[PDB]
Amino acid sequence: KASILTALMIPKRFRPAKDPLDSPQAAAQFLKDNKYRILRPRAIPTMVELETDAALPRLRQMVEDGKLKDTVSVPEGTTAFYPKYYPFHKPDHDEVGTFGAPDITLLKQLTFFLLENDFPTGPETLRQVREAIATLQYGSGSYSGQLNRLLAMKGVATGRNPNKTPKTVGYTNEQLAKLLEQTLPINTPKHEDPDLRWAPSWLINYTGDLSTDKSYLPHVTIKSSAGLPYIGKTKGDTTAEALVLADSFIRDLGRAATSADPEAGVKKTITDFWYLSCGLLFPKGERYTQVDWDKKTRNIWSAPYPTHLLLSMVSTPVMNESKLNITNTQTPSLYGFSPFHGGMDRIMTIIRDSLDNDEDLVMIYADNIYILQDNTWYSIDLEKGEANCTPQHMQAMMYYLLTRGWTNEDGSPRYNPTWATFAMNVAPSMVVDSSCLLMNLQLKTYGQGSGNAFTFLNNHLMSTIVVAEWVKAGKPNPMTKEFMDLEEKTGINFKIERELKNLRETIVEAVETAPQDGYLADGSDLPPIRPGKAVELDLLGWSAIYSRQMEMFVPVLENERLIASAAYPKGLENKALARKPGAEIAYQIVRYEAIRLVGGWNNPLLETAAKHMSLDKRKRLEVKGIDVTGFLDDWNNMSEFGGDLEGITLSEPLTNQTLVDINTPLDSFDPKARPQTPRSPKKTLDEVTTAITSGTYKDPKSAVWRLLDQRTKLRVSTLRDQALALKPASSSVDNWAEATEELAQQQQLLMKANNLLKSSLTETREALEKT
Ligand SMILES: [Cl-]
Ligand SMILES: [K+]
């Protein structure tokens, strides 16, 4: 019985608080009070329409064939205005909808299944999912979170442990390159890949003939932001404009560098294209802690499309040929590592051999360091990695790429003076210690912009410096003050994230507790009643579980990440796909299959609930006669785990065979059969460090490499003379090696003059910030 009034008419959803910093006035005051640098704002000319065939002559046929728009929009207007970037933050105080909704259906299903099943780990799984729903929130944070994040970046860069250039730490570019030959082994780009000698649009071959139509340019995310000067546009809306701007910037830089006044010309080009150094401060979508919603929002420094393209032309041809890591090469690098297809078992074999031989082990992946020492596994992360970066760290990376990557077999460069100018003299100051845009505020970026094309490379170099210093200090244990003292030594902040004790015993336990029943145990299509002990390496987010069926370790997503993903799944995040009938149900199937595939299969309660949900959806589709195989075959793009599990289809329900197939290695593994690094093959990181400590590798032997190192010390007014010193090697003239030797000697001699010594990175930053 209820009243007529009533008759007439699970954790609660998180509602973010009102954000007091959501206005330019309040945000600017907050930053001023916290002494965060706000730049004097710079203006961008309005857009002018130009004919595509005049601006991009190489693409005339594409315009004629109606495959490319006949006009391009470029910032050449008579009036210039200050740009404004207002990102959405969801959920927010006024809007708590489907975006960032926790999976309450899964929570109810986990509860129903726990009541029917006696899984000993079942109560803890339910408790963890409920706790993650109650304490976390998937979304794009807040203006307060973004602003507080900027303060933390400034604190890392300039606070307790101010940043140090590699030169202050005690490394020359050549010494760093010797370390990188070991920690980031690289191959040269393919001989058929064009050298760094051209305007980007010249790398497009279009005639209409499908058999030959090719682009030698890097691939791009079409739906991603164009960045400045095209706020609100995607890369798909602005590819022609990006080519025009990237061609103009490289062309103007090249002409200015060899002009009668290189300093005036180079500075003018940099000032005219200032916006190529300013990133849109995009709030990153993550599973944030509800109580810290306004205290921290991670940012993506959204690089201008032309800058992204020019930087990617230097890095991607090298990196595409350099998927060299500890599982296939004798290197600490984890670059290109996959724990699938036997990857985790190769890691476990290396770990087990190190433990058996009483050897220390180090692994590096960007801002992640892994140390095995004293029967303990340590996970060390750089503290807000990007904030530690100086333009000189990126310049050392450019030096490494141009000396070890962009080089011919005879030692001649695979670049001309224009590209050496962009790469060495300008590019590091475009994305490191430059600026970002939030609302109408042009803010200083402390360190490198997170998400720029060189993020991974720059972070990897910083971890390389920390590791080289660790080796130099006699490998102090990560839990000691001697290890923590490497922060001040390097100017790089870091923290011990994980300490996995009794490693040897943990591995024995993981093998012994491996279940006899279920997936990868006896190979049935059921989870184990009692999962075995995981080796919680958190190796790029992965733990290791022993398989009795396959007689190997296999990866499972680290528990906390698995629970967070189950509690707050990412939605479809594609309005076009979402409007197609069956895309939502297909995405729901994908979400439940992917959570099982990454590790849910080994969590009995989670596997039971997720299997039931995906089977129920498939059954409904079958009865209804609705075919979604198209979406299920091309599932990768609709899943946060899509990049992790390539080459598999979700059109058939997950079985033991799916788990066998994803873990199947192409080849057997022998760690002793791994090739040595392409450069200094016989040398180890320890031998290189010993050589450096003694004063070796200060200068490269190659005159071409000496010119490139001198390029990092000489002021911009010397660019025309530096171009003349490089022209013989760059043109591969007869006797270029002897000619380069004489020119590098003449240049080293003239460098005695201190008035010629100024970082072009400082000159670039000064020209970018000019008002
Ligand atoms: Cl940031
Ligand atoms: K620092």
mmCIF file of N, CA, C and O in Angstrom, residues 395-470:
data_model
loop_
_atom_site.group_PDB
_atom_site.id
_atom_site.type_symbol
_atom_site.label_atom_id
_atom_site.label_comp_id
_atom_site.label_asym_id
_atom_site.label_seq_id
_atom_site.Cartn_x
_atom_site.Cartn_y
_atom_site.Cartn_z
ATOM 1 N N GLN A 395 67.129 17.452 -29.183
ATOM 2 C CA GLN A 395 68.194 17.740 -30.120
ATOM 3 C C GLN A 395 69.202 16.566 -30.169
ATOM 4 O O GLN A 395 69.679 16.220 -31.252
ATOM 5 N N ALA A 396 69.481 15.937 -29.009
ATOM 6 C CA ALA A 396 70.351 14.777 -28.920
ATOM 7 C C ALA A 396 69.679 13.583 -29.643
ATOM 8 O O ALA A 396 70.370 12.805 -30.305
ATOM 9 N N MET A 397 68.338 13.464 -29.535
ATOM 10 C CA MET A 397 67.579 12.428 -30.232
ATOM 11 C C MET A 397 67.646 12.656 -31.751
ATOM 12 O O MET A 397 67.879 11.711 -32.500
ATOM 13 N N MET A 398 67.462 13.916 -32.199
ATOM 14 C CA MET A 398 67.590 14.282 -33.618
ATOM 15 C C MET A 398 68.986 13.945 -34.132
ATOM 16 O O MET A 398 69.114 13.410 -35.229
ATOM 17 N N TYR A 399 70.021 14.229 -33.324
ATOM 18 C CA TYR A 399 71.410 13.913 -33.663
ATOM 19 C C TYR A 399 71.562 12.387 -33.886
ATOM 20 O O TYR A 399 72.214 11.963 -34.842
ATOM 21 N N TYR A 400 70.983 11.578 -32.974
ATOM 22 C CA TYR A 400 71.028 10.131 -33.057
ATOM 23 C C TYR A 400 70.328 9.617 -34.332
ATOM 24 O O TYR A 400 70.890 8.775 -35.039
ATOM 25 N N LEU A 401 69.135 10.144 -34.633
ATOM 26 C CA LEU A 401 68.384 9.752 -35.824
ATOM 27 C C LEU A 401 69.093 10.113 -37.118
ATOM 28 O O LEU A 401 69.114 9.296 -38.039
ATOM 29 N N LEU A 402 69.693 11.311 -37.184
ATOM 30 C CA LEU A 402 70.378 11.786 -38.388
ATOM 31 C C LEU A 402 71.738 11.151 -38.602
ATOM 32 O O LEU A 402 72.161 11.013 -39.748
ATOM 33 N N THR A 403 72.413 10.720 -37.515
ATOM 34 C CA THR A 403 73.716 10.069 -37.644
ATOM 35 C C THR A 403 73.561 8.565 -37.860
ATOM 36 O O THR A 403 74.195 8.033 -38.762
ATOM 37 N N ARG A 404 72.717 7.888 -37.064
ATOM 38 C CA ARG A 404 72.546 6.428 -37.165
ATOM 39 C C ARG A 404 71.443 5.967 -38.120
ATOM 40 O O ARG A 404 71.494 4.836 -38.611
ATOM 41 N N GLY A 405 70.452 6.820 -38.352
ATOM 42 C CA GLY A 405 69.356 6.483 -39.250
ATOM 43 C C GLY A 405 69.545 7.040 -40.644
ATOM 44 O O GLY A 405 69.693 6.276 -41.594
ATOM 45 N N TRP A 406 69.554 8.383 -40.779
ATOM 46 C CA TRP A 406 69.640 9.082 -42.069
ATOM 47 C C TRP A 406 71.063 9.178 -42.627
ATOM 48 O O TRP A 406 71.595 10.272 -42.905
ATOM 49 N N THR A 407 71.672 7.993 -42.804
ATOM 50 C CA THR A 407 73.039 7.859 -43.303
ATOM 51 C C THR A 407 73.117 6.755 -44.358
ATOM 52 O O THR A 407 72.450 5.722 -44.227
ATOM 53 N N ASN A 408 73.915 6.980 -45.406
ATOM 54 C CA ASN A 408 74.118 5.987 -46.466
ATOM 55 C C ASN A 408 75.232 5.054 -45.994
ATOM 56 O O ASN A 408 75.952 5.412 -45.056
ATOM 57 N N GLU A 409 75.399 3.880 -46.640
ATOM 58 C CA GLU A 409 76.466 2.922 -46.282
ATOM 59 C C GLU A 409 77.877 3.533 -46.309
ATOM 60 O O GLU A 409 78.712 3.161 -45.482
ATOM 61 N N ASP A 410 78.134 4.481 -47.232
ATOM 62 C CA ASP A 410 79.446 5.144 -47.344
ATOM 63 C C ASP A 410 79.662 6.280 -46.298
ATOM 64 O O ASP A 410 80.714 6.939 -46.329
ATOM 65 N N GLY A 411 78.660 6.521 -45.431
ATOM 66 C CA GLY A 411 78.730 7.544 -44.397
ATOM 67 C C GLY A 411 78.226 8.908 -44.822
ATOM 68 O O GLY A 411 78.229 9.839 -44.016
ATOM 69 N N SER A 412 77.794 9.048 -46.086
ATOM 70 C CA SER A 412 77.242 10.306 -46.589
ATOM 71 C C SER A 412 75.806 10.506 -46.013
ATOM 72 O O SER A 412 75.106 9.519 -45.722
ATOM 73 N N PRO A 413 75.380 11.764 -45.781
ATOM 74 C CA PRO A 413 74.055 11.978 -45.173
ATOM 75 C C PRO A 413 72.887 11.703 -46.112
ATOM 76 O O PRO A 413 73.009 11.934 -47.319
ATOM 77 N N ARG A 414 71.738 11.269 -45.543
ATOM 78 C CA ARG A 414 70.485 11.084 -46.282
ATOM 79 C C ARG A 414 69.589 12.293 -45.984
ATOM 80 O O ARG A 414 68.400 12.164 -45.698
ATOM 81 N N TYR A 415 70.194 13.485 -46.040
ATOM 82 C CA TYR A 415 69.518 14.759 -45.810
ATOM 83 C C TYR A 415 70.330 15.878 -46.436
ATOM 84 O O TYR A 415 71.515 15.708 -46.718
ATOM 85 N N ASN A 416 69.697 17.021 -46.648
ATOM 86 C CA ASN A 416 70.372 18.187 -47.179
ATOM 87 C C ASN A 416 70.469 19.259 -46.054
ATOM 88 O O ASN A 416 69.887 19.062 -44.982
ATOM 89 N N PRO A 417 71.174 20.400 -46.262
ATOM 90 C CA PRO A 417 71.242 21.426 -45.198
ATOM 91 C C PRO A 417 69.903 21.960 -44.676
ATOM 92 O O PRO A 417 69.794 22.263 -43.487
ATOM 93 N N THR A 418 68.885 22.058 -45.538
ATOM 94 C CA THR A 418 67.548 22.535 -45.144
ATOM 95 C C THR A 418 66.945 21.624 -44.067
ATOM 96 O O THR A 418 66.476 22.113 -43.029
ATOM 97 N N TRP A 419 66.964 20.306 -44.314
ATOM 98 C CA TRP A 419 66.431 19.338 -43.364
ATOM 99 C C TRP A 419 67.285 19.219 -42.099
ATOM 100 O O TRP A 419 66.720 19.056 -41.034
ATOM 101 N N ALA A 420 68.626 19.384 -42.199
ATOM 102 C CA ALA A 420 69.511 19.394 -41.023
ATOM 103 C C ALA A 420 69.156 20.625 -40.151
ATOM 104 O O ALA A 420 69.166 20.519 -38.935
ATOM 105 N N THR A 421 68.799 21.769 -40.788
ATOM 106 C CA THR A 421 68.399 23.019 -40.130
ATOM 107 C C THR A 421 67.093 22.807 -39.389
ATOM 108 O O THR A 421 67.020 23.116 -38.202
ATOM 109 N N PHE A 422 66.074 22.268 -40.073
ATOM 110 C CA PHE A 422 64.813 21.987 -39.417
ATOM 111 C C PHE A 422 65.011 21.044 -38.217
ATOM 112 O O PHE A 422 64.653 21.393 -37.096
ATOM 113 N N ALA A 423 65.578 19.870 -38.467
ATOM 114 C CA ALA A 423 65.766 18.816 -37.463
ATOM 115 C C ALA A 423 66.606 19.230 -36.264
ATOM 116 O O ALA A 423 66.185 19.046 -35.125
ATOM 117 N N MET A 424 67.779 19.817 -36.514
ATOM 118 C CA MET A 424 68.705 20.177 -35.437
ATOM 119 C C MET A 424 68.483 21.527 -34.820
ATOM 120 O O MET A 424 68.689 21.680 -33.621
ATOM 121 N N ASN A 425 68.169 22.533 -35.650
ATOM 122 C CA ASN A 425 68.144 23.918 -35.216
ATOM 123 C C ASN A 425 66.843 24.477 -34.753
ATOM 124 O O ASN A 425 66.847 25.401 -33.946
ATOM 125 N N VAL A 426 65.728 23.962 -35.293
ATOM 126 C CA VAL A 426 64.405 24.516 -35.072
ATOM 127 C C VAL A 426 63.453 23.559 -34.348
ATOM 128 O O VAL A 426 62.904 23.939 -33.303
ATOM 129 N N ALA A 427 63.224 22.345 -34.935
ATOM 130 C CA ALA A 427 62.291 21.306 -34.441
ATOM 131 C C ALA A 427 62.294 21.079 -32.927
ATOM 132 O O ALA A 427 61.198 21.049 -32.381
ATOM 133 N N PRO A 428 63.450 20.971 -32.199
ATOM 134 C CA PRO A 428 63.357 20.734 -30.748
ATOM 135 C C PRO A 428 62.644 21.831 -29.955
ATOM 136 O O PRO A 428 61.971 21.511 -28.978
ATOM 137 N N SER A 429 62.742 23.103 -30.399
ATOM 138 C CA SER A 429 62.081 24.234 -29.730
ATOM 139 C C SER A 429 60.615 24.434 -30.148
ATOM 140 O O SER A 429 59.909 25.263 -29.572
ATOM 141 N N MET A 430 60.153 23.647 -31.116
ATOM 142 C CA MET A 430 58.764 23.720 -31.555
ATOM 143 C C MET A 430 57.865 22.933 -30.628
ATOM 144 O O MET A 430 56.697 23.285 -30.465
ATOM 145 N N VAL A 431 58.393 21.849 -30.020
ATOM 146 C CA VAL A 431 57.572 20.986 -29.160
ATOM 147 C C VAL A 431 58.073 20.829 -27.729
ATOM 148 O O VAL A 431 57.406 20.158 -26.928
ATOM 149 N N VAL A 432 59.260 21.391 -27.419
ATOM 150 C CA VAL A 432 59.826 21.310 -26.062
ATOM 151 C C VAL A 432 60.022 22.726 -25.567
ATOM 152 O O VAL A 432 60.622 23.526 -26.286
ATOM 153 N N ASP A 433 59.512 23.025 -24.336
ATOM 154 C CA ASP A 433 59.544 24.344 -23.697
ATOM 155 C C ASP A 433 58.949 25.427 -24.623
ATOM 156 O O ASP A 433 59.475 26.541 -24.723
ATOM 157 N N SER A 434 57.909 25.056 -25.378
ATOM 158 C CA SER A 434 57.228 25.998 -26.252
ATOM 159 C C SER A 434 55.941 26.451 -25.553
ATOM 160 O O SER A 434 56.014 26.957 -24.420
ATOM 161 N N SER A 435 54.775 26.247 -26.163
ATOM 162 C CA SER A 435 53.550 26.734 -25.550
ATOM 163 C C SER A 435 52.345 25.877 -25.883
ATOM 164 O O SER A 435 52.410 24.964 -26.700
ATOM 165 N N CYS A 436 51.247 26.171 -25.222
ATOM 166 C CA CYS A 436 49.979 25.500 -25.441
ATOM 167 C C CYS A 436 48.842 26.526 -25.347
ATOM 168 O O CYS A 436 49.042 27.665 -24.888
ATOM 169 N N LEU A 437 47.662 26.127 -25.813
ATOM 170 C CA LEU A 437 46.500 26.986 -25.812
ATOM 171 C C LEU A 437 45.372 26.340 -25.031
ATOM 172 O O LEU A 437 44.989 25.200 -25.309
ATOM 173 N N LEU A 438 44.852 27.083 -24.046
ATOM 174 C CA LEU A 438 43.717 26.674 -23.231
ATOM 175 C C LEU A 438 42.850 27.912 -23.076
ATOM 176 O O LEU A 438 43.322 28.928 -22.560
ATOM 177 N N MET A 439 41.584 27.840 -23.555
ATOM 178 C CA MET A 439 40.644 28.981 -23.609
ATOM 179 C C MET A 439 41.335 30.003 -24.551
ATOM 180 O O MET A 439 41.776 29.594 -25.621
ATOM 181 N N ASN A 440 41.530 31.264 -24.139
ATOM 182 C CA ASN A 440 42.245 32.263 -24.939
ATOM 183 C C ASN A 440 43.697 32.456 -24.421
ATOM 184 O O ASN A 440 44.406 33.351 -24.896
ATOM 185 N N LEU A 441 44.134 31.609 -23.461
ATOM 186 C CA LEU A 441 45.456 31.712 -22.827
ATOM 187 C C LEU A 441 46.530 30.904 -23.539
ATOM 188 O O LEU A 441 46.362 29.710 -23.776
ATOM 189 N N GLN A 442 47.619 31.582 -23.893
ATOM 190 C CA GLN A 442 48.790 30.985 -24.518
ATOM 191 C C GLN A 442 49.771 30.778 -23.369
ATOM 192 O O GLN A 442 50.296 31.731 -22.781
ATOM 193 N N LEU A 443 49.869 29.520 -22.958
ATOM 194 C CA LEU A 443 50.624 29.139 -21.765
ATOM 195 C C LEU A 443 51.918 28.497 -22.096
ATOM 196 O O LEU A 443 52.013 27.758 -23.070
ATOM 197 N N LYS A 444 52.903 28.711 -21.245
ATOM 198 C CA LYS A 444 54.190 28.047 -21.381
ATOM 199 C C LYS A 444 53.996 26.525 -21.204
ATOM 200 O O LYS A 444 53.195 26.087 -20.369
ATOM 201 N N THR A 445 54.709 25.733 -22.015
ATOM 202 C CA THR A 445 54.770 24.291 -21.836
ATOM 203 C C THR A 445 56.110 24.041 -21.146
ATOM 204 O O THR A 445 57.147 24.443 -21.670
ATOM 205 N N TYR A 446 56.081 23.418 -19.960
ATOM 206 C CA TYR A 446 57.290 23.054 -19.217
ATOM 207 C C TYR A 446 57.616 21.630 -19.612
ATOM 208 O O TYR A 446 56.828 20.708 -19.334
ATOM 209 N N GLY A 447 58.740 21.474 -20.314
ATOM 210 C CA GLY A 447 59.162 20.198 -20.861
ATOM 211 C C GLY A 447 58.561 19.975 -22.240
ATOM 212 O O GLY A 447 58.213 20.928 -22.953
ATOM 213 N N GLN A 448 58.469 18.715 -22.648
ATOM 214 C CA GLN A 448 57.929 18.408 -23.966
ATOM 215 C C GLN A 448 56.411 18.238 -23.880
ATOM 216 O O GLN A 448 55.867 17.828 -22.831
ATOM 217 N N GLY A 449 55.742 18.584 -24.976
ATOM 218 C CA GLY A 449 54.305 18.413 -25.050
ATOM 219 C C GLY A 449 53.956 16.943 -25.205
ATOM 220 O O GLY A 449 54.390 16.301 -26.161
ATOM 221 N N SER A 450 53.202 16.398 -24.250
ATOM 222 C CA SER A 450 52.767 15.001 -24.240
ATOM 223 C C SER A 450 51.822 14.686 -25.409
ATOM 224 O O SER A 450 50.744 15.259 -25.503
ATOM 225 N N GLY A 451 52.268 13.804 -26.299
ATOM 226 C CA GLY A 451 51.519 13.447 -27.493
ATOM 227 C C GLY A 451 52.211 13.895 -28.764
ATOM 228 O O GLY A 451 51.827 13.455 -29.843
ATOM 229 N N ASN A 452 53.249 14.765 -28.668
ATOM 230 C CA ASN A 452 54.002 15.161 -29.855
ATOM 231 C C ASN A 452 54.663 13.874 -30.467
ATOM 232 O O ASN A 452 54.848 12.884 -29.758
ATOM 233 N N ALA A 453 55.013 13.902 -31.764
ATOM 234 C CA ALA A 453 55.605 12.786 -32.504
ATOM 235 C C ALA A 453 56.858 12.167 -31.834
ATOM 236 O O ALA A 453 57.127 10.971 -32.041
ATOM 237 N N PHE A 454 57.619 12.984 -31.043
ATOM 238 C CA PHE A 454 58.861 12.542 -30.377
ATOM 239 C C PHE A 454 58.685 12.204 -28.898
ATOM 240 O O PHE A 454 59.693 12.009 -28.209
ATOM 241 N N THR A 455 57.417 12.131 -28.399
ATOM 242 C CA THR A 455 57.149 11.840 -26.980
ATOM 243 C C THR A 455 57.887 10.610 -26.499
ATOM 244 O O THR A 455 58.662 10.710 -25.548
ATOM 245 N N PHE A 456 57.657 9.456 -27.167
ATOM 246 C CA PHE A 456 58.276 8.178 -26.821
ATOM 247 C C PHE A 456 59.815 8.297 -26.874
ATOM 248 O O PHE A 456 60.495 7.895 -25.931
ATOM 249 N N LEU A 457 60.358 8.795 -28.000
ATOM 250 C CA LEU A 457 61.804 8.938 -28.223
ATOM 251 C C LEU A 457 62.496 9.790 -27.164
ATOM 252 O O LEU A 457 63.518 9.362 -26.622
ATOM 253 N N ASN A 458 61.932 10.971 -26.857
ATOM 254 C CA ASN A 458 62.496 11.889 -25.859
ATOM 255 C C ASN A 458 62.464 11.292 -24.469
ATOM 256 O O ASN A 458 63.459 11.404 -23.747
ATOM 257 N N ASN A 459 61.336 10.615 -24.105
ATOM 258 C CA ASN A 459 61.181 9.938 -22.810
ATOM 259 C C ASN A 459 62.193 8.793 -22.683
ATOM 260 O O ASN A 459 62.797 8.623 -21.635
ATOM 261 N N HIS A 460 62.364 8.010 -23.758
ATOM 262 C CA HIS A 460 63.303 6.888 -23.840
ATOM 263 C C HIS A 460 64.740 7.357 -23.617
ATOM 264 O O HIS A 460 65.499 6.679 -22.914
ATOM 265 N N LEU A 461 65.110 8.524 -24.208
ATOM 266 C CA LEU A 461 66.434 9.092 -24.024
ATOM 267 C C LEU A 461 66.635 9.482 -22.552
ATOM 268 O O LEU A 461 67.699 9.207 -21.977
ATOM 269 N N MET A 462 65.621 10.082 -21.923
ATOM 270 C CA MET A 462 65.704 10.457 -20.512
ATOM 271 C C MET A 462 65.861 9.222 -19.609
ATOM 272 O O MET A 462 66.698 9.245 -18.710
ATOM 273 N N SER A 463 65.122 8.124 -19.898
ATOM 274 C CA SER A 463 65.277 6.877 -19.145
ATOM 275 C C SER A 463 66.679 6.283 -19.373
ATOM 276 O O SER A 463 67.292 5.763 -18.439
ATOM 277 N N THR A 464 67.213 6.428 -20.596
ATOM 278 C CA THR A 464 68.561 5.982 -20.960
ATOM 279 C C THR A 464 69.624 6.684 -20.077
ATOM 280 O O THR A 464 70.557 6.020 -19.632
ATOM 281 N N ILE A 465 69.464 8.003 -19.833
ATOM 282 C CA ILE A 465 70.350 8.823 -18.988
ATOM 283 C C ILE A 465 70.272 8.324 -17.532
ATOM 284 O O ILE A 465 71.314 8.097 -16.917
ATOM 285 N N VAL A 466 69.047 8.092 -17.022
ATOM 286 C CA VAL A 466 68.862 7.558 -15.666
ATOM 287 C C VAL A 466 69.571 6.185 -15.514
ATOM 288 O O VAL A 466 70.353 5.988 -14.575
ATOM 289 N N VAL A 467 69.344 5.270 -16.478
ATOM 290 C CA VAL A 467 69.955 3.936 -16.473
ATOM 291 C C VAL A 467 71.492 3.982 -16.590
ATOM 292 O O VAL A 467 72.174 3.303 -15.828
ATOM 293 N N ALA A 468 72.030 4.822 -17.493
ATOM 294 C CA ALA A 468 73.471 4.988 -17.663
ATOM 295 C C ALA A 468 74.095 5.474 -16.331
ATOM 296 O O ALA A 468 75.162 4.983 -15.924
ATOM 297 N N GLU A 469 73.401 6.394 -15.632
ATOM 298 C CA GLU A 469 73.845 6.905 -14.327
ATOM 299 C C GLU A 469 73.782 5.841 -13.232
ATOM 300 O O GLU A 469 74.666 5.797 -12.377
ATOM 301 N N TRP A 470 72.759 4.962 -13.290
ATOM 302 C CA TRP A 470 72.583 3.829 -12.372
ATOM 303 C C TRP A 470 73.767 2.860 -12.542
ATOM 304 O O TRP A 470 74.380 2.464 -11.548
#
